[PDB]
């Protein structure tokens, strides 16, 4: 019975898929524990959230993107919520994300892929603290 | 061009209809300006919010219900947002709410009716400042 | 807190709208109290069910139709279930049934209109007894 | 058993609502008789199509809009299609179009309203001639 | 061309997912041959149905749950109905069930997983004769 | 950034699944480059289109099918469209096509499977030439 950190990304807002995305998690019975809306995320939280990636080439365009529009940060709660919401998520790569998954059905880009989801018990605690210090 | 305040009531959470409702508003092309998730709204906001209903016979049951579960406060923005989002909502009486409207399709009870939405300009400014001070 | 009698009509089965129809009643929170599936309704129950119409011109083609395919007979239960399920139903006439309603969204014919719904407290008791003698 | 002409406006394409719109009409049992897709329509057909509004203040802006993106021209067939696809359509004015209708659900602007539908019999032949000569 | 037996479990009724499930099967083009609504399935059918599970540590909780609410028994018919409807269903382990499948999209629990479906020819003939003698 | 050719087979029209199919592709962000609707396709284009199967036992029945009702020819554009719309498609064989895919969800037959999609780059130009010369 864990908690994971989801991010709804600015492309979700541009393409009006915010409810479609949250709806897939909702219909699988995961409950919202906490949720915050950001018209524009502070770049600092974004740099924090993606620190493991700071060395990568895409890290800068990634950060630009994440602040280019609103985002919603949600904490969901369920049994094995971390691994299950990741399988809903789908693969980052638009050439490997299966139909049925969020990214497989809706996304078509390596960078603008609608959603972020914690991928581990440690990833979650840390990301959740970043977005929900309280 | 206006802003209106929307409440997603506890029954929406119980029935897993949060996305369904927010999606109906999203497709009509309204923008989220602000949004806050309340695992349990403090009672004194609920009585503030419904302060014009305090002399009514249902008031106390309404407050009890508005704290029985989570709620989401949202400020929406758009052309004639106030009155357009009211029509989407549908009348309060389940015997009146039109099919096609959120309450018309989804609600079956005079109290537990999923959604709130400001009815006027002064009402919205008032309610927005309650949930978003 | 009443009970009403719904019929899902053979055209619903032909056009695969059975789940779509039952889904609209389900999403409005009315509960299934009883339900029976008929691969072909006995013409007698059909003649009974529509007795008030026995004098009409359409009564014969109506009966043919109702037995031309399967039908499901359901009893739903809710507050004011009778009047509410009728407003979901929509108007018999394809020139007056509003969008949003079952018939307004899905039906296009005076005869083959997908669904039947009791229209009164007396209509219901009687129809329910016809389809559910027990 | 009529026929009618239906346009899917550039805002549908912009908003990914093409199937959403066509699906509502398909769902009602109306059938595609013919259908062309235009990446960008000759402005002549547009001024032709909307010739009856040529005097209106909005005529020039409306046409600029109609050539701002792709459009799809469809002929639909079925009993009473013209008047029936017209109630599916809903009111031009976003203050009167009902929930349940394409515009009531999906449109929120006086000009950008996703769909056009023949309003009468002669309107229907008139416009079908324009798009499918 | 086969027949397979499907159970809509009590949790489907609790969550208002009956139509959602039946619709997923309906769209894959399978036909209802028989169907019965059980406001409360008699326990001895449930133990019959799950008779190969009687030595398992979950058996008693499974029976308790299979009578906690209504269920619908359905015989479906179609080409390779048995194995096609099994894939639609998805694995039992929520950690295994694929997105796109009924359990993959909708279920979150090893027990309360919405749906049953015969796994083989002998299994279906057996289960069909239980619910439809 | 590829292009690909997609056909909506007569069974889609028969089953009212045209928007359902096109919607899934639109939803994935692929764009219509051009699109013709055929009430009934010249059998020549069909034998052309399926020229590679001309020897197969099924070739004759498959073509009879492809002219049994209307079809819609679409060119789609987007990054990696060919291979991407191919996984949306799913397996020809109703015993291997996964839930989540058009065929896995909607098709239940080896011949009548709703949609065709170019399988390679040259296949794509090849077929686009046929339908849009
Ligand atoms: N060339 C790339 C690769 C990836 N990304 C972004 O970097 C994010 C995180 O990287 P990655 O780990 O590869 O994707 P995730 O699926 O989110 O996996 P995780 O965060 O758990 O590592 C992706 O969501 C994507 O938006 C990017 O902008 N450009
Ligand atoms: N010319 C007609 C008129 C109606 N009917 C059928 O008769 C049924 C019942 O008649 P009507 O009462 O007009 O329609 P309902 O909307 O079902 O209203 P109710 O049964 O409550 O009277 C309709 O559902 C329709 O299928 C028909 O076959 N041919
Ligand atoms: N008899 C009533 C009437 C209203 N109510 C609740 O009180 C709220 C305010 O009522 P209202 O008449 O202003 O209805 P709306 O403004 O929400 O349409 C409604 O949304 C209902 O949820 C109730 O519990 N019992
Ligand atoms: N004030 C207006 C009114 C309409 N229009 C556009 O012009 C079209 C013709 O208006 P109309 O009154 O015939 O509306 P419909 O026929 O589309 O219902 C509308 O569909 C709008 O797209 C506009 O640009 N500005
Ligand atoms: N550990 C378990 C395993 C199964 N079950 C239930 O027992 C049923 C039979 O289990 P199964 O392994 O045959 O799963 P399916 O055949 O339903 O895929 C499952 O559908 C579950 O609902 C349970 O309650 N606890
Ligand atoms: N045994 C078969 C196999 C395929 N077909 C049809 O012929 C088409 C070509 O088969 P294919 O193996 O290239 O399948 P896809 O390319 O469509 O995935 C299929 O889409 C079927 O419609 C058939 O009629 N009989
Ligand atoms: Mg009020
Ligand atoms: Mg007009
Ligand atoms: Mg088993
Ligand atoms: Mg091939």
């Amino acid at each position: 019975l864990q908690r994971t950190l989801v991010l709804i990304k600015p492309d979700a807002f541009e393409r009006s898929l915010v409810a479609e995305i949250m709806g897939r998690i909702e219909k699988k019975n995961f409950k919202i524990v906490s949720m915050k809306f950001w018209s524009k995320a502070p770049r600092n939280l974004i740099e924090q959230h993606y620190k493991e990636h700071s060395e990568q080439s895409y890290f800068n365009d990634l950060c630009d993107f994440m602040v280019s529009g609103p985002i919603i940060s949600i904490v969901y709660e369920g049994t094995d919520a971390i691994s299950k919401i990741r399988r809903l998520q789908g693969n980052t790569n638009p050439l490997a994300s299966a139909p049925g998954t969020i990214r497989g059905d809706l996304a078509n880009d390596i960078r603008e892929n609608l959603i972020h989801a914690s991928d581990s018990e440690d990833s979650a605690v840390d990301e959740i603290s970043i977005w929900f210090p309280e």
Side-chain angles (χ1 to χ4, degrees), chain A:
Chain A
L1 176 97
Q2 46 203 202
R3 293 171 167 189
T4 183
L5 178 99
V6 168
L7 286 197
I8 307 288
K9 293 174 161 172
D11 55 327
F13 289 80
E14 165 68 35
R15 306 174 59 202
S16 295
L17 290 167
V18 179
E20 173 70 37
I21 294 179
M22 290 173 55
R24 280 156 188 249
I25 297 162
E26 186 174 33
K27 259 174 287 182
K28 191 171 182 67
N29 212 178
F30 294 105
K31 306 297 165 183
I32 295 178
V33 143
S34 294
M35 171 172 66
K36 221 195 163 292
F37 174 82
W38 314 80
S39 51
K40 191 185 191 181
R43 199 173 199 100
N44 178 231
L45 302 173
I46 289 298
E47 270 163 2
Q48 276 310 310
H49 174 99
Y50 273 136
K51 52 193 183 282
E52 289 161 285
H53 301 247
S54 66
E55 320 309 341
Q56 301 319 302
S57 61
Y58 58 72
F59 176 81
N60 226 258
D61 305 315
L62 172 67
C63 282
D64 288 351
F65 167 65
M66 287 297 286
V67 305
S68 76
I71 72 159
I72 288 176
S73 68
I74 317 164
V75 182
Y76 289 103
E77 189 175 76
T79 313
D80 287 327
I82 309 184
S83 92
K84 285 171 182 174
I85 296 176
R86 280 232 108 204
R87 297 212 294 125
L88 251 20
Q89 194 202 228
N91 193 273
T92 322
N93 186 236
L95 300 161
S97 41
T101 68
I102 296 158
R103 282 173 182 167
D105 285 343
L106 302 177
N108 201 177
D109 196 69
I110 180 84
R111 170 168 303 120
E112 300 174 0
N113 49 31
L114 302 163
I115 184 181
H116 159 99
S118 302
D119 63 0
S120 79
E121 215 145 24
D122 290 294
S123 212
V125 194
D126 187 12
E127 284 169 11
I128 287 180
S129 81
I130 293 180
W131 291 102
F132 300 87
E134 334 90 48

